[PDB]
Design a protein around this nucleic acid. Structure first.
Ligand SMILES: [Mg+2]
Ligand SMILES: [Mg+2]
Ligand SMILES: [Mg+2]
Ligand SMILES: [Mg+2]
Ligand SMILES: [Mg+2]
Ligand SMILES: [Mg+2]
Ligand SMILES: [Mg+2]
Ligand SMILES: [Mg+2]
Ligand SMILES: [Mg+2]
Ligand SMILES: [Mg+2]
Ligand SMILES: [Mg+2]
Ligand SMILES: [Mg+2]
Ligand SMILES: [Mg+2]
Ligand SMILES: [Mg+2]
Ligand SMILES: [Mg+2]
Ligand SMILES: [Mg+2]
Ligand SMILES: [Mg+2]
Ligand SMILES: [Mg+2]
Ligand SMILES: [Mg+2]
Ligand SMILES: [Mg+2]
Lengths: 129, 55, 88, 71, 100
RNA sequence: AAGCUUGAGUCUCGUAGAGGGGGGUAGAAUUCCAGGUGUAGCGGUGAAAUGCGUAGAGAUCUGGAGGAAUACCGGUGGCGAAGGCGGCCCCCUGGACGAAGACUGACGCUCAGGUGCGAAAGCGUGGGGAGCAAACAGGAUUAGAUACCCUGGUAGUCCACGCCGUAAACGAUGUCGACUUGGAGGUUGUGCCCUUGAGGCGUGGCUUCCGGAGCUAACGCGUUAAGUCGACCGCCUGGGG
C-alpha cells in the first residue's frame, strides 16, 4: 500500500512530462518542500505554491523547452526496503557531473556539488536527470 | 405509469395461464414501451409474482 | 433477529466523552455481539461453509486492537475483557 | 507371517476371480506367486504382477475369444 | 415486527365455511398488538389448471402485520386442515385501497 | 511522550443479488405399481438380431407411489477471495455499493510454518434407488473392436455424518495503494433540469469492446495493467529421465 510518500512525488513528475500538462495537485509534507526547493534553483521545476487551509497542498509546475522534456529519467536509491549510504569521497556523479543528485545532508537537502565542498555528508535520495 | 412501485396491479396484463398479452381489450395508450414491456424484465430476478402458474 | 433498535443500547454501555457518537471502548462492543451470534451456529446446520469463512475477517480484527492501546493506556483493557468476557 | 503369506491370495484370488483374467487353472496361479513373492516391492505385489499379465503373458488375459470360437 | 400477507384458498365444494374460517383466525392476530391493513374478497372465479378434482376456488386476501412468534404456528394450521388446498406468503408489502 | 486529517474503520437513514444453509410447497416429463378400452405388433440401428409380447405389450385417458432436475422468462447479466450455486419460497445470516452529516485519529500493506475453504472422481460408517451411466454379458461384426453403433445393469450421481486436498481450479494475469490523451454498448444508486422532446448536462461501484502515447521478440495488453512508481511473498536456473 501507500508506504512511501517520496516515491509518489517522483511519479507525478515522470508521468507528467509525457501527458504535457500545466500543474499537478498533490498533498505537501515537510520533506516535499525541501525537495521542491532544490529543483527550483535547477531548471527542473519552475515554482511551487502551498495554498491549502484544510491541509498543505503542493502544486508543482513543469517546464517545457522547445519540443523536449526537461526531466530525462529518475531512478530510486534510498528505497524503504533497502537503504544505500555513501561516503563524502564516494559520492556518485550523475551523468558524469551533468546530473543533479538530490542528497539529504545533516544541515538540509542540497545538491551533490555543494556537499563535497561545504557542510558534511548525507544520504542520496535519488538520481534526478 | 412512470414509477416502479406498481407491483400490485399486473392482473390486467398477464393471465392465469402464464402468457403476457398487450393491453388491447380496453383500448388505451401503448406509447410506454420501454417502461412496460422492457422494464418488466428487471423484476424477473427476484420473480416475486409467478410468471408461469403452470410450472 | 438483528434489528436496528436492539443495537441502540450497545453504544450507551461505553462512553468517554459527551454528546459523542463514538468512544474508544465502543469499537469492540459493536463487533463482539456480531461474532458471538455467529459462533453458536457451528454446532447446528454443520453444512454451513460460507458462514465459516466470514469469521476469518472478524475474529482476527481483535488481535490488531490489542497492540493499539497497549503502548498508550493499559487500564483501558481492564474494562473490555471482563465485561464483554473477551479472552478471559 | 501375514505380511508375506496372507498377502499371496489377496493377490492371487484377484486374478483368478476376475472374469477377464479367469482364463487359468487354480494350481497354475498358485505357483506363479510363490515364485514371484520376492520379485516386486511389498506394496506392489499384485500391482506389478499385472506387468506379467500385459507386457508379458498377455492376450491370454481376456483370453482367446471362445464366445467368438463357438460363434 | 415486519409486514406479511397470507393469501390462501378454501375448499371449492365448501363455500359456506368462508365467513366462518376468517372469523376464528382474526382473533389470535389482534390481541398480539396487530391490526388488519386491507381486507378484500375476490370470489370464486375460473382458473387455468384443472389440477384439483373440483376446479372452483375462493381466494382470500388480507393484510396483517403479525409478529414472528405467531406465524410459526399459524402457517402449520392450514397443513392439518383438509379444506385448505395451498397458500401464498409474500414479504415487505404495504397496504392499498384496491389491487384490480 | 504529546496532536491533527487528505487513507477512511464503525454506526444511523435506503436500494439491488442463483451469497450460504436448514424446512415446506407446486408443475411438467421418464419409468414402475392398479381399472376400462384396444391385440401381432412395439422399442431400437443406413440392411440383420438380441430385449420387451397371447399370464393383456406399445400407444392414449384418469389416479397413485417413489426419485431427480428447474424449460420459455435467460443478456459474457447479477453475486462470491476462489471453487461453486438459477423454480415461486419461510426462518437465520454474511459481503459489496450509493448518499447529504458526526465521532474515534494510520487499529495500515504483505508473508514461511500452521489453520480453514476447495468441482468432479474415489473411500469408510448408515439410507434412498424411478432414469442415465465406469467393469461385467446378450445380440451384430469381421482369417480377433474390452474404439465408435444397439439392447441391460452392479458402484457412483441424490441425502445425514467423515476422510483424502487432487484439474486447462485459466483471467495461463498474487494482493494492496498511487499516477496516467478518450470514445462507443449493459446492469445497479443518489441529484439537477421544462423527466412536459420517457433525455441532455453531474457524481460512484461492477462488467464488455476498441484505440493513441508508452511498454514487450511477436501476437497483444493499453485508466480493471501485461504502462509508469513503491511495499511484501512464492516459484522457476536447458530439453528428457
Ligand atoms: Mg462439505
Ligand atoms: Mg501516536
Ligand atoms: Mg439464495
Ligand atoms: Mg393398464
Ligand atoms: Mg385378434
Ligand atoms: Mg399420464
Ligand atoms: Mg419407487
Ligand atoms: Mg463541528
Ligand atoms: Mg479528535
Ligand atoms: Mg493478505
Ligand atoms: Mg462428489
Ligand atoms: Mg469431494
Ligand atoms: Mg458413498
Ligand atoms: Mg473453473
Ligand atoms: Mg496455474
Ligand atoms: Mg464481483
Ligand atoms: Mg485493447
Ligand atoms: Mg510481459
Ligand atoms: Mg535439467
Ligand atoms: Mg541434464
Amino acid at each position: 500500500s501507500m508506504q512511501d510518500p517520496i516515491a509518489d512525488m517522483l511519479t507525478r513528475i515522470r508521468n507528467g512530462q509525457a501527458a504535457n500538462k500545466a500543474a499537478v495537485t498533490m498533498p505537501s509534507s515537510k520533506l516535499k518542500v525541501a525537495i521542491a526547493n532544490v529543483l527550483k534553483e535547477e531548471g527542473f521545476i519552475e515554482d511551487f505554491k502551498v495554498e491549502g487551509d484544510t491541509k498543505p497542498e503542493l502544486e508543482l509546475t513543469l517546464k517545457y523547452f522547445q519540443g523536449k522534456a526537461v526531466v530525462e529519467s529518475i531512478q530510486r536509491v534510498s528505497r524503504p526496503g533497502l537503504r544505500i549510504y555513501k561516503r563524502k569521497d564516494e559520492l556518485p556523479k550523475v551523468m558524469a557531473g551533468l546530473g543533479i543528485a538530490v542528497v539529504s545532508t545533516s544541515k538540509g537537502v542540497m545538491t551533490d556539488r555543494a556537499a563535497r565542498q561545504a557542510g558534511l555528508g548525507g544520504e542520496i535520495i535519488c538520481y534526478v536527470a | 405509469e412512470i414509477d416502479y412501485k406498481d407491483i400490485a396491479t399486473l392482473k390486467n396484463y398477464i393471465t392465469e395461464s402464464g402468457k403476457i398479452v398487450p393491453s388491447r381489450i380496453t383500448g388505451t395508450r401503448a406509447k410506454y414501451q420501454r417502461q412496460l414491456a422492457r422494464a418488466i424484465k428487471r423484476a424477473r430476478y427476484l420473480s416475486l409474482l409467478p410468471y408461469t402458474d403452470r410450472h | 433477529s438483528l434489528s436496528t433498535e436492539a443495537t441502540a443500547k450497545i453504544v450507551s454501555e461505553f462512553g468517554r466523552d459527551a454528546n459523542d457518537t463514538g468512544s474508544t471502548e465502543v469499537q469492540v462492543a459493536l463487533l463482539t455481539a456480531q461474532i458471538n451470534h455467529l459462533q453458536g451456529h457451528f454446532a447446528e446446520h454443520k453444512k454451513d461453509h460460507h458462514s465459516r469463512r466470514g469469521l476469518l475477517r472478524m475474529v482476527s480484527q481483535r488481535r490488531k486492537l490489542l497492540d493499539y492501546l497497549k503502548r498508550k493506556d493499559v487500564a483501558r483493557y481492564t474494562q473490555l475483557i471482563e465485561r464483554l468476557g473477551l479472552r478471559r | 507371517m501375514k505380511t508375506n503369506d496372507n498377502y499371496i491370495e489377496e493377490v492371487t484370488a484377484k486374478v483368478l476371480t476376475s472374469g477377464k483374467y479367469s482364463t487359468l487353472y487354480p494350481p497354475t496361479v498358485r505357483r506363479v506367486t510363490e515364485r514371484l513373492f520376492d520379485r516386486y516391492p511389498p506394496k506392489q505385489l499384485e500391482k506389478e504382477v499385472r506387468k506379467k499379465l500385459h507386457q508379458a503373458y498377455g492376450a491370454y488375459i481376456g483370453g482367446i475369444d471362445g464366445k467368438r470360437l463357438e460363434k | 415486527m415486519r409486514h406479511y400477507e397470507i393469501v390462501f384458498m378454501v375448499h371449492p365444494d365448501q363455500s359456506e365455511q368462508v365467513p366462518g374460517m376468517i372469523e376464528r383466525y382474526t382473533a389470535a392476530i389482534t390481541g398480539a398488538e396487530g391490526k388488519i391493513h386491507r381486507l378484500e374478497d375476490w370470489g370464486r372465479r375460473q382458473l387455468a389448471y384443472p389440477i384439483n378434482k373440483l376446479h372452483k376456488a375462493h381466494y382470500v386476501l388480507m393484510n396483517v402485520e403479525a409478529p414472528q412468534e405467531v406465524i410459526d404456528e399459524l402457517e402449520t394450521t392450514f397443513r392439518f386442515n383438509d379444506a385448505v388446498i395451498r397458500s401464498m406468503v409474500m414479504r415487505t408489502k404495504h397496504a392499498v385501497t384496491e389491487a384490480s
